[PDB]
Design a protein around this ligand. Structure first.
Ligand code: HEM
Ligand code: HEM
Ligand code: HEM
Ligand code: HEM
Ligand SMILES: O=C1NC(=O)c2c(NCc3cc(O)cc(Cl)c3)cccc21
Ligand SMILES: O=C1NC(=O)c2c(NCc3cc(O)cc(Cl)c3)cccc21
Lengths: 156, 156, 156, 156, 156, 156, 156
């Protein structure tokens, strides 16, 4: 079904954000695992998986709309060097992601692509859940201290 | 069954305390969940539900006694800004509650409303168990330290 | 995540409506149970529980957006004195609630808070189901007569 | 299998009748559900489903006989404005339906299309059971009164 | 264990009320069954059984306190001749019975027979549950009308 | 609940489209079954059923909004004469249907009937799935050839 | 455990190849699904997953050996425009991957990193299986014809 060119461009922009997040969250997960922080490693793995699922749906939607999904262009990974930085890099990525999501929803609405909007809204709900998680972790580091915080994420 | 007017006033006073506590504990529970202190949030949720059940039984007793239950006149919620203060706000509300319970029981006994007395005594037992919980948490904060206490309440 | 100030104000207004409904439906339920109209009492109890679940989600969303949920202010309960009046009181409350939900949705849309919009839309669907139930009961009273209507709501 | 042209015309007329009845019964069912008369709504739904199954067998038979099933021409729906009229409208439709079925069976017999006769006889048995139901409901309205009759059809 | 002479007189007074109630409710049950009001009959049967159980516990307590249970003196049965009258006779009996239970409890408290008081408090809770049932039935008769009320009690 | 008059007009137009689709898909299904293309027949049968369910929800919504569902007017069925034409006929109908759904959604949004909008969005999601199916079948005919395409749809 | 610098460079180069393959196979999978070639889509999806698992193990080895996994640099995807091209593009990528795997194994053997060699040998075995699958498909297209080949890959 011939989709709107600018909707397809927005969907590819969203997909690009997801493809960064897949790699960033996966590397962070494996870094936390390598350091023995397996509860962080496991949770971050699941966040990577969720972004893979979102990317799948974006790819399927773009193809349905007779556009070309762009898996070639990979933007900049925001990789941290310690736990606090890694969590803040994830949060910085997610805040960029939700901005792009809202702007894409605006355009979907304007051209009456209500199904694409609904997909983007569902992704937006998942990204906001991830922001909640990250902001919560950063706060917990302040409330319990970093040493306790890391201790609590050693074991699953 | 036509009840004693002052018994009904006492029951409405106890009901009004339960209505305060329902909201205060519910909000405290949600705050703790939002901060990632999910063990506190779940416990405080169960306290809120327990107060809901007491409010139900009071409403039912008042109507049996041909009174008008008063769910309109909400008193002041004691909301803290940190865990220590929230625990102390809960404890302060519970001391007011048990004082008012004792006085209502005195009056039930005087007018021979032994069934209302038995209900209030059961509520009093529940509120004293809540006081023991609160006093114990405030004591653990001293013994284990605030950061450890919070760390032990991150996960359910 | 820092939410829009007016969204949080709209969310607290919807919550304020839900807090009224919880108490109004819970009281109506227990009055119907006291009168032996147990099917009305049970249905109205589930209406109250559903408002409780809505208030929960509103509180959780307000806190995620870094607002302060307002459980202190309680508006006017519309308590009827008989079954026709109680049903009409519930319907009056619900029509005010849905007016406020639509105005809140408009504003969420304009500030691109599509997740809050989705929450409010789900609450609105539930409120329109309750309106359908209420209008149907009022119509049944006309079709079968008040004495039959009440007879049919004696047993659960 | 090339069938008799007049038989096919009869089958298309009966199909026409079933198509009216599908839509009339489905609308009546949903009106009754909207009014809170769920037992009537459910029974009328099942009547609609039964006519849908008859239309399916007529369509299949016409196609086997190398005719063109006519799903395009929809005759007049008889929609009531209250229960009493709705039942009589269904009954008026059924009486037309059975008169046409009998004339079709006569023609099937004359041209030795004994299988089409058997299909039509089975549909006729279904329509006579529907007439039995409808006559019985209208008799019950007289015996128990309209308010009782309607009361008895509120719940499933 | 030697009991207080006046407590034992109070226990025998309450026993005498239960013994009246056993027979009045049993006969009312069986009258209602004979009339085809089987839901009233079954419920009144269970009220009789509950009174039998209270009488058992009272007999048992009196004998432990080395008194003589008086099963000889049977007070006046209040036997109605129609449903509304029967319920009012049960209610009248229950109000006399709860008056006596309150007076007996006062004296147990005075002489420190706190186990006997607790037994009597349990019995009083059951009698106040029965008062609630009776008052509700009489109210229902007014709200749905006698003919409907009886109709709803033909079948279990 | 008093619906917007123009929303109700839109809902009746979408309902009108669904009623065409029910009949067209049902007839196409039974043609495919008569020709021995049972997998196409069963798939198209399920498309018809899906449209019946949409029609049901529209009828229910219209009645709730105190409008009159129009089941009397039946637009033009697009009946193909072979498999390729039948699929393209279905696709032409779906493309009209989604255009009308988008226009209906626009109006629902502008008058704040967000629940009607949500219903229509869910139907649009189902219609866009049906467009994907149809486009895919027509593309498969080109990729595997008509004879293989039909062969692959002989058996369920 | 500090690893050999060039071993790690070899591992990051194999990882780069796997990252290309992940995206190339996932896009090809979703293209085939969009075209209705669901058996090809499913198989190509599992090929993508298996490269994902290979990339995970490579990332985990690199981190253990105290190197930095490079998920930032993404080589050239070879995307076909039809089934035959897509299979050949996959095969071209696999032939490059196996050449790079052999050279890496040579180096691991020379510096005695036997565990890295064993990991790469396992990956090589999987890639040779993929080569086998791809050459076989290309051969089948010649043997059965493209239309039959595609036909056989419509349905899982
Ligand atoms: C801020 C106001 C309130 C909130 C946010 C709230 C929240 C909740 C929630 C989330 C539940 C559990 C529902 C479920 O099972 O999913 C619940 C249950 C319940 N609520 Fe409330 N509630 C409120 C006020 C009240 C009040 C005022 C009453 C009584 C007057 C009440 C009576 C009950 C009862 C009896 C239950 C059943 C609990 C059980 O037995 O499991 N609630 N409430
Ligand atoms: C009019 C006089 C009475 C009648 C007609 C009557 C009738 C009955 C009946 C029909 C049952 C059910 C037995 C069964 O089928 O298993 C029963 C149970 C019983 N009755 Fe009576 N009864 C009478 C008096 C009494 C008295 C005076 C007492 C005690 C002093 C008593 C104590 C009990 C007890 C303890 C049970 C067992 C209840 C249970 O646990 O189910 N009854 N009676
Ligand atoms: C107003 C138009 C129609 C409406 C609203 C309607 C509605 C429905 C509904 C709601 C169902 C149940 C679906 C499910 O939950 O599984 C159904 C089933 C069915 N419909 Fe219709 N329908 C319509 C017209 C037709 C027509 C014209 C035909 C055939 C010519 C038909 C044939 C069928 C059949 C065969 C079934 C399955 C019944 C069974 O065996 O259980 N419908 N319909
Ligand atoms: C275009 C980029 C990618 C897409 C679209 C994608 C998609 C998917 C999907 C749909 C799943 C299945 C999730 C589920 O339903 O359970 C999955 C699983 C997985 N992915 Fe990815 N992925 C991508 C990139 C990556 C990368 C870069 C890695 C690691 C380097 C990776 C590692 C994994 C792993 C380990 C699994 C679990 C598979 C299993 O064992 O079942 N993926 N991916
Ligand atoms: O309700 C209808 N039923 C039909 O059959 C029909 C049409 N016919 C198309 C057709 C299909 C064939 O295989 C063969 C022929 Cl000659 C015709 C057209 C409009 C409406 C209807
Ligand atoms: O397709 C149709 N849908 C309808 O509603 C309808 C009719 N309506 C009768 C009616 C029912 C009411 O409750 C109230 C009114 Cl004033 C009218 C009549 C013919 C055809 C149709």
């Amino acid at each position: 079904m011939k989709g709107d060119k600018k909707v397809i461009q927005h969907l590819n922009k969203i997909l690009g954000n997801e493809l960064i997040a897949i790699n960033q969250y996966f590397l962070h997960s494996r870094m936390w695992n390598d350091w023995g922080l397996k509860r962080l490693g496991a949770h971050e793995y699941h966040e990577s998986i969720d972004e893979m699922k979102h990317a799948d749906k974006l790819i399927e939607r773009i193809l349905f709309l007779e556009g070309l999904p762009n898996l070639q262009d990979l933007g900049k990974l925001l990789i941290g060097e310690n736990t606090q930085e890694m969590l803040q890099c994830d949060l910085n990525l997610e805040l960029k992601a939700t901005k792009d999501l809202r702007e894409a929803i605006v355009h979907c609405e304007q051209v009456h692509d209500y199904v694409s909007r609904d997909l983007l809204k569902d992704i937006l709900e998942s990204e906001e859940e991830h922001i909640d998680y990250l902001e919560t972790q950063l706060g917990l580091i302040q409330k319990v201290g970093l040493e306790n915080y890391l201790q609590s994420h050693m074991h699953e």
